Design an enzyme around this catalytic site. Structure first.
Site, PDB file in Angstrom:
ATOM      1  CB  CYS A  38      -0.843   0.054   1.287  1.00  0.00           C
ATOM      2  SG  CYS A  38      -2.056  -1.265   1.585  1.00  0.00           S
TER       3      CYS A  38
HETATM    4  C1  LIG Z   1       0.469   0.940   6.172  1.00  0.00           C
HETATM    5  C2  LIG Z   1      -0.311   0.510   7.426  1.00  0.00           C
HETATM    6  C3  LIG Z   1      -1.750   0.991   7.246  1.00  0.00           C
HETATM    7  C4  LIG Z   1      -2.443   0.012   6.291  1.00  0.00           C
HETATM    8  C5  LIG Z   1      -3.945   0.106   6.575  1.00  0.00           C
HETATM    9  C6  LIG Z   1      -4.617   0.000   5.223  1.00  0.00           C
HETATM   10  O1  LIG Z   1      -4.998   1.294   4.782  1.00  0.00           O
HETATM   11  C7  LIG Z   1      -5.895  -0.820   5.311  1.00  0.00           C
HETATM   12  C8  LIG Z   1      -5.917  -2.263   4.792  1.00  0.00           C
HETATM   13  C9  LIG Z   1      -7.238  -3.066   4.821  1.00  0.00           C
HETATM   14  C10 LIG Z   1      -7.607  -3.611   3.411  1.00  0.00           C
HETATM   15  C11 LIG Z   1      -6.488  -4.435   2.776  1.00  0.00           C
HETATM   16  O2  LIG Z   1      -6.365  -5.576   3.702  1.00  0.00           O
HETATM   17  C12 LIG Z   1      -7.469  -5.416   4.645  1.00  0.00           C
HETATM   18  C13 LIG Z   1      -8.491  -4.738   3.768  1.00  0.00           C
HETATM   19  C14 LIG Z   1      -7.129  -4.341   5.690  1.00  0.00           C
HETATM   20  C15 LIG Z   1      -8.144  -4.373   6.854  1.00  0.00           C
HETATM   21  C16 LIG Z   1      -7.720  -3.388   7.923  1.00  0.00           C
HETATM   22  C17 LIG Z   1      -8.809  -2.706   8.788  1.00  0.00           C
HETATM   23  C18 LIG Z   1      -8.441  -1.714   9.906  1.00  0.00           C
HETATM   24  C19 LIG Z   1      -9.683  -1.496  10.788  1.00  0.00           C
HETATM   25  C20 LIG Z   1      -9.209  -1.056  12.189  1.00  0.00           C
HETATM   26  C21 LIG Z   1      -8.558   0.325  12.213  1.00  0.00           C
HETATM   27  O3  LIG Z   1      -7.496   0.461  11.562  1.00  0.00           O
HETATM   28  O4  LIG Z   1      -9.050   1.190  12.989  1.00  0.00           O
END
Ligand SMILES: CCCCC[C@H](O)/C=C/[C@H]1[C@H]2CO[C@H](C2)[C@@H]1C/C=C/CCCC(=O)O
Ligand SMILES: CCCCC[C@H](O)/C=C/[C@H]1[C@H]2CO[C@H](C2)[C@@H]1C/C=C\CCCC(=O)O
Length: 155
Positions: A38
């Site tokens: 990402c």
């Molecule tokens: C670089 C670290 C941040 C990465 C977060 C990224 O924007 C989200 C990734 C999602 C989608 C791809 O893999 C799955 C679906 C992932 C699920 C994450 C959900 C976070 C919900 C909780 C929260 O972050 O508050």
């Protein structure tokens, strides 16, 4: 618990790529085959911390998510509150050269996610060099992650 010495938040801003991770989440040990690199854009927040804006592709569209990392009282240390998971997490920039890589470490601090632990590799390019991948593997081992919990994220 180390934070990058003499951390310069302004030099940490801009475009990064989430290039690797390791976690103690059973969920990762299973659902890692599905994870992709990402882009994450880091910008200063109103409170003196950081907004992290991450994007990922789903079907024909690029979704955007924002996470507020509030300052936690030493430079390079932050806290993140997840309303969906009812938990707060400590996020630290453990090591960075600003221009190529950062090694981040996140851990649960409050709520049901307290046990959570995760190492992250940020890269300024989408192709981290072998030496950086070796650094990250070594970093993860120092943090107690076994080899099959460490994931390098494909572009
Ligand atoms: C670089 C670290 C941040 C990465 C977060 C990224 O924007 C989200 C990734 C999602 C989608 C791809 O893999 C799955 C679906 C992932 C699920 C994450 C959900 C976070 C919900 C909780 C929260 O972050 O508050
Ligand atoms: C079996 C229920 C646990 C679901 C497993 C899930 O993949 C783990 C998610 C972790 C990581 C993402 O947000 C945090 C860190 C979450 C904390 C783990 C369990 C939350 C339980 C919620 C609750 O019990 O109120």
């Amino acid at each position: 618990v180390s934070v990058q010495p003499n951390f310069q938040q302004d030099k940490f801003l801009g475009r990064w790529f989430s290039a690797g991770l390791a976690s103690n989440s059973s969920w990762l040990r299973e659902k890692k085959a599905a994870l992709s690199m990402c882009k994450s854009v880091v910008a200063p927040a109103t409170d003196g911390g950081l907004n992290l804006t991450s994007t990922f592709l789903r079907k024909n569209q690029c979704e955007t998510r924002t996470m507020l990392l509030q300052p936690a009282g030493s430079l390079g240390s932050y806290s993140y509150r997840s309303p969906h998971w009812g938990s707060t997490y400590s996020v630290s920039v453990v090591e960075t050269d600003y221009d190529q890589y950062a090694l981040l470490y996140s851990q649960g601090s409050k709520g049901p996610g307290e046990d959570f632990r995760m190492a992250t590799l940020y890269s300024r390019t989408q192709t981290p060099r072998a030496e950086l991948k070796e650094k990250f593997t070594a970093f993860c081992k120092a943090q107690g992650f076994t080899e099959d919990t460490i994931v390098f994220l494909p572009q």
